[PDB]
Every structure is written in C-alpha cells, then in structure tokens.
Amino acid sequence: QQYGTLASIAAKLGISRTTVSNAYNRPEQLSAELRQRILDTAEDMGYAGAIGVLLTEDLTYAFEDMASVDFLAGVAQAAGDTQLTLIPASPASSVDHVSAQQLVNNAAVDGVVIYSVAKGDPHIDAIRARGLPAVIADQPAREEGMPFIAPNNRKAIAPAAQALIDAGHRKIGILSIRLDRANNDGEVTRERLENAQYQVQRDRVRGAMEVFIEAGIDPGTVPIMECWINNRQHNFEVAKELLETHPDLTAVLCTVDALAFGVLEYLKSVGKSAPADLSLTGFDGTHMALARDLTTVIQPNKLKGFKAGETLLKMIDKEYVEPEVELETSFHPGSTVA
Secondary structure (H helix, E strand, C coil), X not given: CCCCHHHHHHHHHCCCHHHHHHHHHCHHHXXXXXXXXXXXHHHHCCCCCEEEEEECCCCCHHHHCHHHHHHHHHHHHHCCCCEEEEEECCCCCXXXXXXXXXXXXXXXXXXXXXXXXXXXXXXXHHXXXXXXXXXXXXXXXXXXXXXXXXXXXHHHCHHHHHHHHHCCCCCEEEEEECCCCCCCCEECCHHHHHCCCCCCHHHHHHHHHHHXXXXXXXXXXXXXXXXXXXXXXXXXXHHXXXXXXXXXXXXXXXXXXXXXXXXXXXXHHXXXXXXXXXXXXXXXXXXXXXXXXXXXXXXXXXXXXXXXXXXXXXXXXXXXXXXXXXXXXXXXXXXXXX
C-alpha cells in the first residue's frame, strides 16, 4: 500500500485528502463524477480456506525461536487472507503412527508446510496416508511427492569452520540442537551422530568436521555436545557443560545462532567474553545475531518461508512447482574472529 496513499491521490487531482476519503466512506459528500475520478485514479495507482504448518516442537517455538519466526513471517506473506494453522507435533520417541495420524487427520487444513522435521518422523507418514498436499522446509529431504526447500547445509557451514581454522584454532568444540528422537543432552557419541535422523544438524556437524579434518584435526579430539530442547535455558546449560568440561577449547562452532547466544550468556556469567576468551561462530543470521555482529552464516529464512507457502498454494491450485530448491546462504565475517 505505502504511506500517504490518500494524500497522493488528492495531490494528483488537486483536491483534499478528506475529499478522497469521502469517495470511500461518505459518497454522498461529492458528485458521482468526482467519486468515479477518485476511484479510477486510485485504480491507476494500484490502490478461500486454510493452510497448516507442522512443527515438531512446542507451539511456543513458533514465537520464541527467532529463526522460526522469520520463517513463519515468510509463510504469512505467501498466504495472504489464508488462515494459518500451527500444528504442535511431539518429537518424543514414544510417538507411534496412531498418535501421529490422529493429530494429522484432525488438522482442518487444505495443505501443510512441514517445518524442520526429522527423517522417519511418523507425522510425515501420517500426512502421506491422508494424501495432504505438502511441502517440506529444511528437512526431511528426499520424500516422494513433497517439494523441498533448503540451503545446502554441509556447504553453508564450511565458511564458518574454515574461518575458525584460518585464525589458527585447533582445539575446537561443537554445539548442536536435536539430533534424533531418543532424548539426549550433553556429550554426543559417534553412534548418535552417525545415525542422526535430524539432517541439518547432522549435516552441519559433518560439513564443519570435514573442514577440520582437511586442516589436520583428528575428529575424535573435537567434543560435540547437544541440547534436545532448544531453549534459552538449555542453550546456556549445554554451553556451560562443554566449556566447563573442556576448559582448553579456544573456539566453539555452533549449528544454530541460538546456541551461540547460550555461549555468550555463559561466558558473561563467568566474566569472560568473545572473542578474547573464546572464538565462536553461529548459523542463521537472526536480527539479534547481526546486532551483536556475531560471526555466522546468513540464511534467508523469511524467503524460505515465502517460497514454502507459495509452493504449497501452487500445489493446491494444481500448479507446477520445482521438486527441489536450494536456498543460497552468505557468510557474515562478523566480530567474534580473533
């Protein structure tokens, strides 16, 4: 729309903004000819169902995890006057198909945007069994009949791990969020990582590790901790444990900006800061990350959401959509280098 629209219309016609307003709210205040002129001039100026989003997190996540809120803004922009229904799906390993299928079959939507769900998640199968048009964002990749939108994580993370190596860091630690259904906080074992169903996490860990290996670092020396639940409180805890357990670490590479902030809130509690005491990297590029000028990987989350919702709507409208789209990311040198 853009600010001052009524004033512009009045200016172009040499009348008052109230004159223009009356054309809309008080037609009787002016002649049928001036009303038409105001309306046409407005024209020259350019002046039904519901879709869902399956979140394998607590409904709060959609409003407290800033990366997800930027994504959803994007889905909100594609869907115009379309009702948007957030569907809270439990990520617990106890969930079976009957539970997932009842949740899904009771979602009053014409389509669903699957947001960052583990590969092999029973909700995915439930959606397929219902034949609900669906688009996937971030993960899971390679689902038949379900368009996929995401950046190449193994590659998008390279610039961050590389930046750490270029500053001569070798005692590096890694932090991640949920890697699998079976709950796990703290140390991540090779087995949990290798069998991780939460691609993105697994792939961002892998891509970073691949850059460290090329640097000479032996994988077994790089500690990897995780927090099953992604909270401000858990991000803090998992950061304390890693730095408290491996005090010799000079840098910490995070799979998500949130984790980096848990590392900053932790360093802060012990009088330290970053860099100086510790070099850290993030991934996402949230508004807060950029304000702190955190070294991180910028990901266009709002665009990812817009393409997601658009792809969904075109699907429901029997339009053509690309089966796979790779979103580009860009490294943000930031100021947590040293």
